Tab-separated table of N, CA and C in Angstrom:
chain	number	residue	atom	x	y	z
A	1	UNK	N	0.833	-1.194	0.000
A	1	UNK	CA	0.000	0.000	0.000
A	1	UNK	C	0.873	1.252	0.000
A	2	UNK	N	0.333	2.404	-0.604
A	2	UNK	CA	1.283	3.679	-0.737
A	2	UNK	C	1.073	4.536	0.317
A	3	UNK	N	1.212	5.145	1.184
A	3	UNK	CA	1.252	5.933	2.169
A	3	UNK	C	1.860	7.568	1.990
A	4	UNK	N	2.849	7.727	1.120
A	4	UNK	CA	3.030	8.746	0.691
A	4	UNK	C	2.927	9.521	0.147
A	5	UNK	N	2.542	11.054	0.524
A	5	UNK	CA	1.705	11.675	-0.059
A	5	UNK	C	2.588	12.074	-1.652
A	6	UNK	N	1.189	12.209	-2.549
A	6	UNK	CA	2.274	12.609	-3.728
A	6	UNK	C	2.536	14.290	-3.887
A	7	UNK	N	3.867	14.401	-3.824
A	7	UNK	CA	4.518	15.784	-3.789
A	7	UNK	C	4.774	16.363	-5.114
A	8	UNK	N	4.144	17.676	-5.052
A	8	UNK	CA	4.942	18.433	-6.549
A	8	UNK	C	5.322	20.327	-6.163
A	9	UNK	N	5.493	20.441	-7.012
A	9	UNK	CA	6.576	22.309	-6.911
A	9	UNK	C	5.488	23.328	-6.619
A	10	UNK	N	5.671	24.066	-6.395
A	10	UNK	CA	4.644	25.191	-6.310
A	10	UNK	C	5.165	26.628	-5.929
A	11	UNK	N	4.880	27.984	-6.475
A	11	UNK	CA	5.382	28.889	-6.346
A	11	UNK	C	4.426	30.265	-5.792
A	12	UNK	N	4.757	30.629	-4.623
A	12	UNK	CA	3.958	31.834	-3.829
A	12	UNK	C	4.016	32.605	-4.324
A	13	UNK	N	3.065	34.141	-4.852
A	13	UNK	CA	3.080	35.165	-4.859
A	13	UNK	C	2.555	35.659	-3.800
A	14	UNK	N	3.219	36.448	-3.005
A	14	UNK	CA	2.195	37.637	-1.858
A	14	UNK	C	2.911	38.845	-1.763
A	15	UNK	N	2.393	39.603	-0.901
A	15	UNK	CA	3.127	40.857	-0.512
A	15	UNK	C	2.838	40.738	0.646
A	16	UNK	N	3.624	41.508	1.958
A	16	UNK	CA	3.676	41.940	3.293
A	16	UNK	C	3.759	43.416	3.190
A	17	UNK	N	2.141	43.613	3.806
A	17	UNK	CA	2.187	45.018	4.143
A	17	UNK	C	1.940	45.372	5.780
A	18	UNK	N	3.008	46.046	6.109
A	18	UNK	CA	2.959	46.270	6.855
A	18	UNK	C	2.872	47.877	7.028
A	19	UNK	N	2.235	48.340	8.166
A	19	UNK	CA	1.494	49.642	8.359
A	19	UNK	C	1.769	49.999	10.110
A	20	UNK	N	2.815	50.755	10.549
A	20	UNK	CA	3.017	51.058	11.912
A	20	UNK	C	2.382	52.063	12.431
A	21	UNK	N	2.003	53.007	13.392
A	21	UNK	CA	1.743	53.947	14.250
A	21	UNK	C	2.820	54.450	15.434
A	22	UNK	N	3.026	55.075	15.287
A	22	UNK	CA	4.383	55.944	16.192
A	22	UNK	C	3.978	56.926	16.715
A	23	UNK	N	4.266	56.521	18.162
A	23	UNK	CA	4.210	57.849	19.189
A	23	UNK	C	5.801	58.568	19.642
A	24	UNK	N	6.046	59.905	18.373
A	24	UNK	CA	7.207	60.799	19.150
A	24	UNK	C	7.260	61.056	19.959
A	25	UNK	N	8.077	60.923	21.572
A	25	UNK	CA	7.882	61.434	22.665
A	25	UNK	C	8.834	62.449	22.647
A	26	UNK	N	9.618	63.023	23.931
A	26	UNK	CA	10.227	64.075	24.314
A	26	UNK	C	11.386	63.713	23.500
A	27	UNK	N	11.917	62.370	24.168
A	27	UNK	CA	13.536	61.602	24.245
A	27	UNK	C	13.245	60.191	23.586
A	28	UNK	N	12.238	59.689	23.333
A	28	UNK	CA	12.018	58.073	22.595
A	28	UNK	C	10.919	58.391	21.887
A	29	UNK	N	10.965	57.091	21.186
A	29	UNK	CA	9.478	56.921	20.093
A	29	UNK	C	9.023	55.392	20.545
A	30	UNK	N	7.916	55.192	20.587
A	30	UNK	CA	6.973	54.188	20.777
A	30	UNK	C	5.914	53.245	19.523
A	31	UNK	N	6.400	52.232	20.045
A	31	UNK	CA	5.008	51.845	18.693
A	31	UNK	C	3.754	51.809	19.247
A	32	UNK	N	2.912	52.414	19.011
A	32	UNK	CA	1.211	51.965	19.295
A	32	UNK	C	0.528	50.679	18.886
A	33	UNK	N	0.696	50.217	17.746
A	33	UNK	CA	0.532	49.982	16.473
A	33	UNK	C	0.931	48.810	15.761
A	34	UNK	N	1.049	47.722	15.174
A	34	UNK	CA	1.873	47.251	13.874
A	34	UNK	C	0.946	46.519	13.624
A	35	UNK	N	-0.024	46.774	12.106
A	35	UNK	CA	-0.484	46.021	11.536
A	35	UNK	C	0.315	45.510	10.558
A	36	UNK	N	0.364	44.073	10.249
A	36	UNK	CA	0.900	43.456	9.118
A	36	UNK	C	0.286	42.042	8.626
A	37	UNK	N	-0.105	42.104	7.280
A	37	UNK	CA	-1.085	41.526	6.425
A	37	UNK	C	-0.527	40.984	5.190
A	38	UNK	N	-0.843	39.638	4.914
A	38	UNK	CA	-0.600	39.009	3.233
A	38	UNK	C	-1.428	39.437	2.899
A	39	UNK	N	-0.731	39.951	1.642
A	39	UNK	CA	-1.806	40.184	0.229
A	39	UNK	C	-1.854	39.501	-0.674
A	40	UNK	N	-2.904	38.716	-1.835
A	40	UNK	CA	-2.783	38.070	-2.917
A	40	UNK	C	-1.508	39.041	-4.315
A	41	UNK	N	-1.027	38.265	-5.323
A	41	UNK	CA	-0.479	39.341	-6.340
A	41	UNK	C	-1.363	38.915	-7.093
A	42	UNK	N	-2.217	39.980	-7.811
A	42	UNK	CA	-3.551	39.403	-8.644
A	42	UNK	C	-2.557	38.982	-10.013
A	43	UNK	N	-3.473	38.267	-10.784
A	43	UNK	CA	-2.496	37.428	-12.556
A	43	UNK	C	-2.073	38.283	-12.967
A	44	UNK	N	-2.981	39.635	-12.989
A	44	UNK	CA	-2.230	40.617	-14.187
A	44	UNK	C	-0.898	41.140	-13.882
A	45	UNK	N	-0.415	40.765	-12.142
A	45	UNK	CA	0.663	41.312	-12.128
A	45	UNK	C	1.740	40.337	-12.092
A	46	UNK	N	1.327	39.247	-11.980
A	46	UNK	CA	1.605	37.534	-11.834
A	46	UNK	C	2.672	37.744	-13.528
A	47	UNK	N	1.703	37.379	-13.860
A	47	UNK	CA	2.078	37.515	-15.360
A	47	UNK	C	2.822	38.542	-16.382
A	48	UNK	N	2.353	39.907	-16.057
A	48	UNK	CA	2.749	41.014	-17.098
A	48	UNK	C	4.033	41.599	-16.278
A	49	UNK	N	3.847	41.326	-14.812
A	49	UNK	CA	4.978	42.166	-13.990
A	49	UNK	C	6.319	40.888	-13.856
A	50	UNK	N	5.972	40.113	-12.927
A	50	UNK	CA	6.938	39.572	-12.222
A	50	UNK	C	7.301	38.422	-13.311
A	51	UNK	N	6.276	37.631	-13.941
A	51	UNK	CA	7.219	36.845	-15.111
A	51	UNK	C	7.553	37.243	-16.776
B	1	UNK	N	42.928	-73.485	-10.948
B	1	UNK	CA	42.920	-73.321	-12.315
B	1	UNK	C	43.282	-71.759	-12.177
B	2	UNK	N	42.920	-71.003	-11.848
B	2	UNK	CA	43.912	-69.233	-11.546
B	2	UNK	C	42.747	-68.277	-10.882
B	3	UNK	N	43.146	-67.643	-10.517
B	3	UNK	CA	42.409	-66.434	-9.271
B	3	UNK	C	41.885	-65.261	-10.240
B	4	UNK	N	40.929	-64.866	-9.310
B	4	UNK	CA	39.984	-63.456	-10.019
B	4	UNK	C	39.697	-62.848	-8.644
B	5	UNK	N	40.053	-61.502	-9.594
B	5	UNK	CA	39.333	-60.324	-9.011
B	5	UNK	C	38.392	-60.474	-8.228
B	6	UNK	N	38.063	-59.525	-7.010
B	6	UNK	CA	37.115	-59.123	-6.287
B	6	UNK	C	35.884	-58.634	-7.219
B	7	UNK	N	36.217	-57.657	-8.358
B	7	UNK	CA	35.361	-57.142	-8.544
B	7	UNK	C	34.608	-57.591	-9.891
B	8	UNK	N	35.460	-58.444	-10.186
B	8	UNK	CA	35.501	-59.623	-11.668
B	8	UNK	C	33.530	-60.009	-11.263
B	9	UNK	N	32.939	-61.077	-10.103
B	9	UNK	CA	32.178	-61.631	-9.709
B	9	UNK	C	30.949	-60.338	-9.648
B	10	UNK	N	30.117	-60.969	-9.980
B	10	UNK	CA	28.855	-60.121	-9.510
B	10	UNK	C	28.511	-59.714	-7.922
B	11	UNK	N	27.595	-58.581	-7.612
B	11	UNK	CA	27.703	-58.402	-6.017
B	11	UNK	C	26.558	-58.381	-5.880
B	12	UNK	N	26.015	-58.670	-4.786
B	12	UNK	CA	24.159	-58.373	-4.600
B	12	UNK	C	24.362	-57.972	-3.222
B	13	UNK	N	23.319	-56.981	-3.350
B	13	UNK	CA	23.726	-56.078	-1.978
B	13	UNK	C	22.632	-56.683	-0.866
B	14	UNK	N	23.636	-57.069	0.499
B	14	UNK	CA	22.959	-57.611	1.655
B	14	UNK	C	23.008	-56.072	2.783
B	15	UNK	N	23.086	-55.054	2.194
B	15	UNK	CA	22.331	-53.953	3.057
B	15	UNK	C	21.629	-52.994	3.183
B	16	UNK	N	20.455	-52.260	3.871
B	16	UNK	CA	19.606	-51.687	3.698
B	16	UNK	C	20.211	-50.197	3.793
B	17	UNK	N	19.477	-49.385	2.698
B	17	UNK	CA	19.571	-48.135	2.147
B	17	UNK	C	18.850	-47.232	3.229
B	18	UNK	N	19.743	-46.414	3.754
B	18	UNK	CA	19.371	-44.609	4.597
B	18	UNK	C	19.680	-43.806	3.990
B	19	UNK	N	18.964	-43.108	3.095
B	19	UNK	CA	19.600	-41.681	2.870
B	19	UNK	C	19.347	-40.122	3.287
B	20	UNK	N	19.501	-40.371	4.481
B	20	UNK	CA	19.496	-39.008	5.483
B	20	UNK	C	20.589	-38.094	4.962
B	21	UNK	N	19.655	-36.951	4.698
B	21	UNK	CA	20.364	-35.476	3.661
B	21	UNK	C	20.071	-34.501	5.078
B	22	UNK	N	20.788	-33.495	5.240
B	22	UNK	CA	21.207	-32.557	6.286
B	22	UNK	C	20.641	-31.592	6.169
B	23	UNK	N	20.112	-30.664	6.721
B	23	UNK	CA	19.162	-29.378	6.369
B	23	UNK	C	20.422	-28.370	6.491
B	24	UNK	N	20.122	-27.700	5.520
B	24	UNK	CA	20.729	-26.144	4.658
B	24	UNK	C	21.124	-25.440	5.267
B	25	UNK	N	22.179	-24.857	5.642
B	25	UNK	CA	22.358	-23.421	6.212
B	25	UNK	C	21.511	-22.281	5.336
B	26	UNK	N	21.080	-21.555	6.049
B	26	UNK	CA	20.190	-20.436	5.428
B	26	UNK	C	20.556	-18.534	5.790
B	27	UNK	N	20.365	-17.790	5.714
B	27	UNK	CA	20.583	-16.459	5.950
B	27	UNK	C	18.984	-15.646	5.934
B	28	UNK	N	18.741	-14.839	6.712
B	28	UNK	CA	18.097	-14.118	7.159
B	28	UNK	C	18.802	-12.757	7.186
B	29	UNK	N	17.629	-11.955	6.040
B	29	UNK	CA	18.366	-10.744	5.939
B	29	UNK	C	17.124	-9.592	6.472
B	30	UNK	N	17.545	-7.727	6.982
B	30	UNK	CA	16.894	-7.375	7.368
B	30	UNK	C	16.062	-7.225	6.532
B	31	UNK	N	14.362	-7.565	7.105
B	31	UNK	CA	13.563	-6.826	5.876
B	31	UNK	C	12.318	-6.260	6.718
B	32	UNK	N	11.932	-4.846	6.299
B	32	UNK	CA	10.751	-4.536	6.642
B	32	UNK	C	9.834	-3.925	5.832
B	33	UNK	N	8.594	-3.807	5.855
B	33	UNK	CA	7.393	-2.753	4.844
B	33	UNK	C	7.731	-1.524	4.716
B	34	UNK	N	7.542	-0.887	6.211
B	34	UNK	CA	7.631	0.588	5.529
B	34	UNK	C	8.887	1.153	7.098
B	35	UNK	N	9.578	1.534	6.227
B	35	UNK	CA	11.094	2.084	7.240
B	35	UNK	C	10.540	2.847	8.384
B	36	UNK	N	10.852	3.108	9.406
B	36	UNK	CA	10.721	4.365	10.786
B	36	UNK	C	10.499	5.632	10.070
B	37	UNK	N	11.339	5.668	8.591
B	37	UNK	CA	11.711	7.211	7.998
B	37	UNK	C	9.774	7.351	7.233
B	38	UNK	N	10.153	6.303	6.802
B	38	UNK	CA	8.717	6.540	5.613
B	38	UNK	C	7.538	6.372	6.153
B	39	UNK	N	7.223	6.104	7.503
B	39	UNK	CA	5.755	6.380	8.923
B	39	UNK	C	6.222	8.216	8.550
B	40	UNK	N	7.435	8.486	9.138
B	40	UNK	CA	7.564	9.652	9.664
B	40	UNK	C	6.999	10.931	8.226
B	41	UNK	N	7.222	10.510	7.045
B	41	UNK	CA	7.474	11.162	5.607
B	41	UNK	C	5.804	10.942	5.419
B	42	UNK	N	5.288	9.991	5.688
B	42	UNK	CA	3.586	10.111	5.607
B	42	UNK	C	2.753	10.615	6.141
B	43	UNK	N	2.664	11.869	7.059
B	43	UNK	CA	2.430	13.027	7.301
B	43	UNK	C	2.298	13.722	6.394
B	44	UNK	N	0.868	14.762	6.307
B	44	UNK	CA	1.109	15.407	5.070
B	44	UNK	C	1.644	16.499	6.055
B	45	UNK	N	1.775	17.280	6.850
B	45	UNK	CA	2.541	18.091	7.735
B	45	UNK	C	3.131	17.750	8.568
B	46	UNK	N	4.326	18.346	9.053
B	46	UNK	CA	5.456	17.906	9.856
B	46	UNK	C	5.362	19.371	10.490
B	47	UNK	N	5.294	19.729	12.316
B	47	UNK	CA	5.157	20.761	13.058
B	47	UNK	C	6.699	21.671	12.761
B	48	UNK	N	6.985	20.476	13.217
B	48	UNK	CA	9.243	21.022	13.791
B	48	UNK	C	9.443	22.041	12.116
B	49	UNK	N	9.415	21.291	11.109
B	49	UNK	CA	9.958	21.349	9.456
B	49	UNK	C	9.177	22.882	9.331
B	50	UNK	N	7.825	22.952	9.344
B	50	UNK	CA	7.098	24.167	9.578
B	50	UNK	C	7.674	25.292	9.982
Protein backbone atom coordinates (compact mmCIF):
# COMPACT_ATOMS: atom_id res chain seq x y z
CA UNK A 1 0.00 0.00 0.00
CA UNK A 2 1.28 3.68 -0.74
CA UNK A 3 1.25 5.93 2.17
CA UNK A 4 3.03 8.75 0.69
CA UNK A 5 1.70 11.68 -0.06
CA UNK A 6 2.27 12.61 -3.73
CA UNK A 7 4.52 15.78 -3.79
CA UNK A 8 4.94 18.43 -6.55
CA UNK A 9 6.58 22.31 -6.91
CA UNK A 10 4.64 25.19 -6.31
CA UNK A 11 5.38 28.89 -6.35
CA UNK A 12 3.96 31.83 -3.83
CA UNK A 13 3.08 35.16 -4.86
CA UNK A 14 2.20 37.64 -1.86
CA UNK A 15 3.13 40.86 -0.51
CA UNK A 16 3.68 41.94 3.29
CA UNK A 17 2.19 45.02 4.14
CA UNK A 18 2.96 46.27 6.86
CA UNK A 19 1.49 49.64 8.36
CA UNK A 20 3.02 51.06 11.91
CA UNK A 21 1.74 53.95 14.25
CA UNK A 22 4.38 55.94 16.19
CA UNK A 23 4.21 57.85 19.19
CA UNK A 24 7.21 60.80 19.15
CA UNK A 25 7.88 61.43 22.66
CA UNK A 26 10.23 64.08 24.31
CA UNK A 27 13.54 61.60 24.25
CA UNK A 28 12.02 58.07 22.60
CA UNK A 29 9.48 56.92 20.09
CA UNK A 30 6.97 54.19 20.78
CA UNK A 31 5.01 51.84 18.69
CA UNK A 32 1.21 51.96 19.30
CA UNK A 33 0.53 49.98 16.47
CA UNK A 34 1.87 47.25 13.87
CA UNK A 35 -0.48 46.02 11.54
CA UNK A 36 0.90 43.46 9.12
CA UNK A 37 -1.08 41.53 6.42
CA UNK A 38 -0.60 39.01 3.23
CA UNK A 39 -1.81 40.18 0.23
CA UNK A 40 -2.78 38.07 -2.92
CA UNK A 41 -0.48 39.34 -6.34
CA UNK A 42 -3.55 39.40 -8.64
CA UNK A 43 -2.50 37.43 -12.56
CA UNK A 44 -2.23 40.62 -14.19
CA UNK A 45 0.66 41.31 -12.13
CA UNK A 46 1.60 37.53 -11.83
CA UNK A 47 2.08 37.52 -15.36
CA UNK A 48 2.75 41.01 -17.10
CA UNK A 49 4.98 42.17 -13.99
CA UNK A 50 6.94 39.57 -12.22
CA UNK A 51 7.22 36.85 -15.11
CA UNK B 1 42.92 -73.32 -12.32
CA UNK B 2 43.91 -69.23 -11.55
CA UNK B 3 42.41 -66.43 -9.27
CA UNK B 4 39.98 -63.46 -10.02
CA UNK B 5 39.33 -60.32 -9.01
CA UNK B 6 37.12 -59.12 -6.29
CA UNK B 7 35.36 -57.14 -8.54
CA UNK B 8 35.50 -59.62 -11.67
CA UNK B 9 32.18 -61.63 -9.71
CA UNK B 10 28.86 -60.12 -9.51
CA UNK B 11 27.70 -58.40 -6.02
CA UNK B 12 24.16 -58.37 -4.60
CA UNK B 13 23.73 -56.08 -1.98
CA UNK B 14 22.96 -57.61 1.66
CA UNK B 15 22.33 -53.95 3.06
CA UNK B 16 19.61 -51.69 3.70
CA UNK B 17 19.57 -48.14 2.15
CA UNK B 18 19.37 -44.61 4.60
CA UNK B 19 19.60 -41.68 2.87
CA UNK B 20 19.50 -39.01 5.48
CA UNK B 21 20.36 -35.48 3.66
CA UNK B 22 21.21 -32.56 6.29
CA UNK B 23 19.16 -29.38 6.37
CA UNK B 24 20.73 -26.14 4.66
CA UNK B 25 22.36 -23.42 6.21
CA UNK B 26 20.19 -20.44 5.43
CA UNK B 27 20.58 -16.46 5.95
CA UNK B 28 18.10 -14.12 7.16
CA UNK B 29 18.37 -10.74 5.94
CA UNK B 30 16.89 -7.37 7.37
CA UNK B 31 13.56 -6.83 5.88
CA UNK B 32 10.75 -4.54 6.64
CA UNK B 33 7.39 -2.75 4.84
CA UNK B 34 7.63 0.59 5.53
CA UNK B 35 11.09 2.08 7.24
CA UNK B 36 10.72 4.36 10.79
CA UNK B 37 11.71 7.21 8.00
CA UNK B 38 8.72 6.54 5.61
CA UNK B 39 5.76 6.38 8.92
CA UNK B 40 7.56 9.65 9.66
CA UNK B 41 7.47 11.16 5.61
CA UNK B 42 3.59 10.11 5.61
CA UNK B 43 2.43 13.03 7.30
CA UNK B 44 1.11 15.41 5.07
CA UNK B 45 2.54 18.09 7.73
CA UNK B 46 5.46 17.91 9.86
CA UNK B 47 5.16 20.76 13.06
CA UNK B 48 9.24 21.02 13.79
CA UNK B 49 9.96 21.35 9.46
CA UNK B 50 7.10 24.17 9.58
Amino acid sequence: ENIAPYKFKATMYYKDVTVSQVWFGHRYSQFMGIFEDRAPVPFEEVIDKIN
Amino acid sequence: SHQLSRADITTVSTFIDLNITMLEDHEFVPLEVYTRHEIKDSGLLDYTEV
